[PDB]
Antibody, heavy 222, light 216 residues
Framework: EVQLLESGGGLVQPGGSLRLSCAVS????????INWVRQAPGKGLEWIGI???????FYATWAKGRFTISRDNSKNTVYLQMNSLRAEDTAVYYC???????????????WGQGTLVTVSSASTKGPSVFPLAPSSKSTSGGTAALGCLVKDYFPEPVTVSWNSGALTSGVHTFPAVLQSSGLYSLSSVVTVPSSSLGTQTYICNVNHKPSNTKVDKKVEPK | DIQMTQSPSSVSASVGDRVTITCQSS???????LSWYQQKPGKAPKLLIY???KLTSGVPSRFSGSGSGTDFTLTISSLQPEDFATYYC???????????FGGGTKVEIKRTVAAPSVFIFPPSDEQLKSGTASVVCLLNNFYPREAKVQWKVDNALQSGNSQESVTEQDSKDSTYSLSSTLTLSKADYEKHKVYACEVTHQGLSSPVTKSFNRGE
């Protein structure tokens, strides 16, 4: 019932600025210390700084300069202002609370879902969505498999969903992979029982916020 | 500077085994300021232990931490398939501005072999309109992760024109899923008839083949 939600994430040009917000719901927070921690894709956790119950703020030696933390208790919100972004600052930025009763101690109990910030000179690109239809012999066998191919987009992420959430079992949404074009691509597959085909409708829902691309493709065998 | 060394960088253990991860920092951390976090793919880190040995609420007794100064250990008594994740250590150094995390330890599960269910997907007509053809081969729910997928167009063994993608280890059955995508230009796709996917894996006596004839 208690979670931190980060926002402001997205595509940024090198040298640009951006302000991420951390808003809590379920607790006051004005009395807790908030930290911002980041993680480059595939890399590890890197602390950026913290802001105490009182406005007092501390930063990682390398962040004190292009990064600024602030809070607005009347809104129950913490803010991270990023300046002169570098390609190296591309990462998932997390919001996390220090265990009540500590300070300076690296104990963070409550985290946010994290929001991805991509610093790149490239323009956003929307994905095409093609169906991966099961074989015509998909009857009998050991259940059928069908899916969606989300191709050519930038930057990450892309969330895929089956039957608006109804279908979750046997779902595999593969990690995206770069293509020679410098664009991402992935596929989401789902195994279902042969009998379900024809009688049950299967639609994958693809959403790529950066380009305001939303698509619902109905996968059908022929 | 601080230097926070965590080893091993990765490790595989069977469910029920004991897993030991150590974290060694050059400057002895500040008075007991050492913590352990668990991070499952796509999710955020989760505090398991702080103060080097205190477990947070709701953390299974199979987790426990020990050590002090410059050497600490995280120990998982009876490894469960749900424990698949990357573990990190955090250290304080009376500077606050020196807070650092270890490089992390990727903990994966060792389970028995399980053969893959193989499927193949021809390119859709919509995509053929765009001038490009993508052929997809799906290897589903198998272990070990190592598998060899080879593309054969009219028997001609392809090479350099396909990319693979693997899902993270499943937290329930500890298996993997892999996709292999052959990507060609429309002219090249229509230049051939038989598109086949040949899979070799520990769970199969002989490699299995999946194919389709373009057109028919």
């Amino acid at each position: 019932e208690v979670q931190l939600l980060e926002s402001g994430g997205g595509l940024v040009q090198p040298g640009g600025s951006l302000r991420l917000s951390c808003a809590v719901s379920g607790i006051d927070l004005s009395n807790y210390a908030i930290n911002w921690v980041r993680q480059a894709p595939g890399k590890g956790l890197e602390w950026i700084g913290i802001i105490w119950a009182s406005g007092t703020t501390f930063y990682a030696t390398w962040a004190k300069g292009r990064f600024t933390i602030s809070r607005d208790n009347s809104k129950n919100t913490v803010y991270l202002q990023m300046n002169s972004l570098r390609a190296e600052d591309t990462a998932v930025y997390y919001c996390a609370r220090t265990v009540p009763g500590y300070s300076t101690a690296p104990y963070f109990d409550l985290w946010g879902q994290g929001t991805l910030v991509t610093v790149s000179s490239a323009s956003t690109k929307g994905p095409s969505v093609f169906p991966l239809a099961p074989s015509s012999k998909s009857t009998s066998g050991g259940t059928a498999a069908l899916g969606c191919l989300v191709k050519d987009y930038f930057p990450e992420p892309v969330t895929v969903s089956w039957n608006s959430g109804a279908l979750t079992s046997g779902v595999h949404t593969f990690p995206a992979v770069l293509q020679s074009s410098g664009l991402y691509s992935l596929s989401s597959v789902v195994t279902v029982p042969s009998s379900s085909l024809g009688t049950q409708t299967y639609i994958c829902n693809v959403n790529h916020k950066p380009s305001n691309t939303k698509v619902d493709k109905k996968v059908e065998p022929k | 500077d601080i230097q926070m060394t965590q080893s091993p960088s990765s490790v595989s253990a069977s469910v029920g085994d004991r897993v030991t991860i150590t974290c060694q920092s050059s400057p002895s951390v500040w008075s007991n300021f050492l913590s352990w976090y668990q991070q499952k793919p796509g999710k955020a880190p989760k505090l398991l232990i702080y103060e080097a040995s205190k477990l947070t609420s709701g953390v299974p007794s199979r987790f426990s931490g020990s050590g002090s100064g410059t050497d600490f250990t995280l120990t998982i008594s009876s490894l469960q398939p749900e424990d698949f994740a990357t573990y990190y250590c955090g250290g304080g150094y009376s500077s606050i501005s020196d807070t650092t995390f270890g490089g992390g330890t990727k903990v994966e599960i060792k389970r028995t072999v399980a053969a893959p269910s193989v499927f193949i997907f021809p390119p859709s007509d919509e995509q053929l309109k765009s001038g490009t053809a993508s052929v997809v081969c799906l290897l589903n729910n198998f272990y070990p992760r190592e598998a060899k997928v080879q593309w054969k167009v009219d028997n001609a063994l392809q090479s350099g024109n396909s990319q693979e993608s693997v899902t993270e280890q499943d937290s329930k059955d500890s298996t993997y899923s892999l996709s292999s995508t052959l990507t060609l230009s429309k002219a090249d796709y229509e230049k051939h008839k038989v598109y086949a996917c040949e899979v070799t894996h520990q769970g199969l006596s002989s490699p299995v083949t999946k194919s389709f004839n373009r057109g028919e």
